[PDB]
Symmetry: D2
Subunit: 355 residues, 4 copies
């Protein structure tokens, strides 16, 4: 168990940006700018800084050239400058390695703390950031597939209850989860900003970054991304979807960048800001929990995820999940799922749905 | 074995107009088509339900007829003039097909009508006269989040596509898109009268069988809603394939299964084909974007399962086996192949379907 | 000027519901349930309790039969039970009339405080509420015009800065406003929940309630409401829109219920939850500030609003605005607006945009 | 009355393109290409050739530099090369001036006939055209406001019945019209391709060109054009809309190019291809006939339209309408409109709907 510090938790506003190490900057730029339409906040020969349509902070995504593609930092904005001090004291009490840079790690961020958190993830906490032109009414720039906000992150970690309790202590509230009757937890979603998630835990070998998610305004914007990828003859980089999620109720798509970093496109989840927001638990065998339409979840979605770095920039060693595998219990040889609980019609045994 | 072109002039066909489907439980079928899908009842009794789409003014687009064996009974096309029903009768007689003409129609809301057993074993109807009903196109008080606005097309399973294609072209259908390979095989063709990608289409397989009937929505989110509704009704297992973007036709689509496994496509936003030199588009059968533009795999049931069709006595037509190569086998079977980019091994699939 | 209490402000989560007095319950039910598709939580011969598609608290709207159509209460949910005590102490320090009921004023609300606030508005603060089936995935019920959330209120008050200062002390943060070059404020929007607004102030004679706003998922859902109103041959109850707002950037529509209570339908504003969220100030003469496409603002939008009640159920006396009128300075016979600041081309003098004058 | 020729009518497929004369080619290019996103088939110092997303013929719009902005030709594609001969013979029998160019009037069109038609309009008929890359799946190019098709033209002409008969003889079928109870026709819509219209007649002084219409896939695409015009601070070039039409049931928008040529953006009308398609007749006083939501029709919509040229390139003289004016009888001083037939409630006397009067 990760104990609760006596030091007060930092007041976390939201997920704010991710720094991804990429191997070929120009190829990554083509994907995130030319295909996906993110907006350039700064670039040079080593980094590209990108933001979504409605953002006013400096960036939502930093692409950093490096030898090994990996998550370098998942950053959360905190409410006040003093909250960076709180974060430092909190993680120090947890016994975690921390690094404070009063002038930031990346451009357009000021005083910032990076930590190797108890689950092995590189978290950053910052308040100070350079404001930029908020493009929310720049419809002269608006793409048919426009990405409008950074929505969340999703982390692969072996022991979901352990991570959950740690995030709850940090002030994240669980909105949805997936469990079975035997008591295993397979996934949880948790928030600060009053949407279904800011970060999420997916049971698996970790620490690995499952995905970063961006929002669109409407469902047709997501469709357009798929349509554009077909036109560019990169439909093989569409991993899963588009679909309606069970968990979150959002319309979604998963796609793969040039280093196989997974990006979710997402819209139209619901408000979770009330403190007694009802928590929704789905059964792992419910074939509408992930895709509400019952489309099968391809195995790669369960098994593949990005490396993460420590504060020296080396790859974090991975810890194998010992709890039951969601893949194995649903679509593996001894797995099953149902459409209607208790009905063998519309159930799937030892394979996935739809055929 | 080639179907000759008649001396007799072809009838001037306007469009696909309605299908008569035999169903086994009229109440279960009513629940699907009316309560789930929202089609509008023009007339019903204890034996039949007459249904129309939101923008239709002719009596119906779908007749559900209770019967012992679920099947297609008639696929009907409307012709331009009452004289065109005469033309149709002379045309099919010269083809040596069985015909039956009724001056007062075979179903309610249709007048003088010709039914035929066509050269591919399908029950075609041709009619002009039909009872006009209230066009509900501005009845936004009734409009469903999933509203089906038009009948768009039919799709027929037949073993020899080129043979069927020539016959439909002589009848005045123009081919808009097709799927072929590098070895002389045709796997599918789409052909039209009304200036959309199709009014009917041919899918290579054992036949005659009816592959599907397609209805249009206004917008893509209407199709998404049908999927969402089916999830809420906990009948997502009746979603067969999709939603997706087609390669062929460029339409947004969904395939669902009614209670007798009759396949319904929901469809929107294909393109205009009414110019007589409309460019024909041919896809290679191994192109993994040809059916679903996003490269999502086509489930085997889509290729193997289709509805029975009846002859004019109401008996099931015998199924003739396809001997040409199978689209399923050559793309997703154990010796199958598909590509994302022609000539690129990366994003290609050997002996398996796309996406894992 | 309204002083800042020493007592701490209650921690307000969001707007939560309004209680509207309506004169004919059956006609109001037809509007809100049959036309708009809101979901019934409870009803009887006296009241109808309604919620939006994604709501889990008991209701977003209470329709209460009474003799005089009016706003009876604008209710905000607070973070904890103890925040209701805080609300009570805060408004007592302000010298406002308060009434506390441990078992609520309306069904499905528990311990609740109502106040006649400094601007004359009946505010409620509550934490306790009866949870109901959250209908967010009930696509078997989902209509083509589905109202998915309660988004905000908008209040007519004569002195906007006075009201704004008071709301800021309550914890609301201003997101956008409308001003002129000579220091007059015409409107302000302010939030708790991290959207553009939870309540807003429109300059005018008050206290009156300008509107209550509900969200849709998508723009087409708003279009459908218009389409449906056309099919029902009640297009005369479409007051204004549909449009794209300047302020808020939301897609919008304003419609009128059977007692002329104004309802806004709204979608796709932006996130405001960061504490240094950039405020946006528009010039009153900017013809894209209200409708981004430049469509004229109908004069009834500026002049008409609902009565509000005091805690005895009597109508609050109206105080006249003395600051300049937005209607007069933009679309009246001495008014003007521009498309491009400083450009005579695309400017309008003594009339509204698009070729119309006031009727 | 225009007689029906003995000579057979050409078989017309559809509206195909317009040639518009523009005064400043770079300005016009900025509008059609940079604002609206049309695709360039060809250009030089004198002309720009543009097509929609789904087109395979060479172009849907030709912009031709000249001294006087005007419609130079409205072009219809015919079914066969032999139909161009039929057109020549048909119009010659009608007593009309004709000009035949075996290699076309504009690039990418072959054998073509231009005519000064009986209503004074420059019509072109052609079959031969250079095919180009059909961009219908080029989602790498697809704009958020993408114009996917050319849909129709709309002509202003003083005597609608006279024009309607002539177009019916040419094979167009009337889908909808607007009349009153005193024998006046104010407008008619008529088709060949199986949509509500390929061309239409609007009562007024003429010949003038009312608009050219392009379609989008979905309603949000039209919304985006408005939004973009707001961002470019050219909302003054949005004339009317967006709305839902009564006539056609389409979602619509009217905008004005740099020479005040009016462009409609349009989506989701219905299928008219059956020969007994029911003809819908709206009453001119029905306030849902033009905008289904009851929004008022701006006076410029009724009064302003583009000049048209003769075959010499000179402007056609305008003949005044003597039949009653739709503007006058609906929104003018002695005008009337209703929301519900026979109901005074929701009716408008001597002014426009929604609280406006003529400027
Ligand atoms: Ca009259
Ligand atoms: Cl999922
Ligand atoms: Cl397909
Ligand atoms: Cl406004
Ligand atoms: Cl109109
Ligand atoms: Fe996610
Ligand atoms: Fe189909
Ligand atoms: Fe509002
Ligand atoms: Fe038009």
């Amino acid at each position: 168990e990760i104990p609760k510090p006596v030091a007060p938790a930092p007041d976390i506003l939201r997920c704010a940006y991710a720094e991804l190490v990429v191997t070929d900057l120009a190829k990554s730029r083509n994907f995130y700018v030319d295909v996906l339409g993110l907006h350039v906040s700064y670039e040079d020969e080593n980094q590209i800084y990108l933001r979504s349509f409605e953002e006013f902070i400096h960036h939502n995504l930093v692409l950093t050239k490096g030898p090994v593609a990996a998550l370098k930092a998942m950053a959360f904005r905190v409410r006040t400058p003093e909250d960076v001090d709180k974060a430092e004291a909190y993680y120090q009490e947890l016994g975690c390695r921390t690094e404070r840079r009063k002038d930031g790690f990346v451009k357009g961020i000021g005083d910032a703390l990076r930590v190797e958190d108890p689950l092995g993830f590189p978290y950053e906490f910052f308040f100070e950031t350079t404001h930029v032109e908020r493009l929310h009414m720049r419809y002269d720039l608006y793409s048919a597939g426009e990405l409008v906000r950074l929505d969340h992150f999703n982390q692969v970690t072996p022991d979901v209850p352990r991570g959950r309790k740690y995030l709850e202590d940090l002030g994240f509230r669980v909105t949805e989860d997936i469990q079975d009757d035997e008591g295993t937890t397979y996934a949880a979603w948790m928030h600060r900003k009053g949407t279904v998630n800011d970060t999420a835990l997916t049971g698996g070998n970790g620490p690995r970054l499952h995905h970063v998610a961006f929002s669109t305004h409407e469902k047709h914007n997501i469709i357009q991304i798929c349509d554009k990828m077909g036109a560019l003859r990169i439909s093989d980089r569409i991993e899963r979807g588009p679909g309606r999620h069970g968990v979150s109720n959002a319309f979604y798509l998963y796609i793969l960048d040039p280093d196989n970093h997974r990006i979710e496109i997402y819209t139209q989840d619901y408000y979770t800001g009330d403190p007694d927001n009802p928590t929704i638990t789905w059964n792992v065998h419910d074939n509408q929990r992930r895709d509400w339409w019952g489309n099968p979840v391809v195995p790669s979605w369960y098994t593949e995820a990005s490396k993460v770095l420590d504060l020296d920039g080396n790859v974090q060693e991975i810890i194998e999940r010992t709890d039951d595998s969601e893949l194995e219990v649903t679509i593996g040889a001894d797995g099953f799922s149902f459409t209607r609980a208790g009905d063998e019609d519309g159930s799937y045994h030892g394979q996935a749905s739809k055929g």
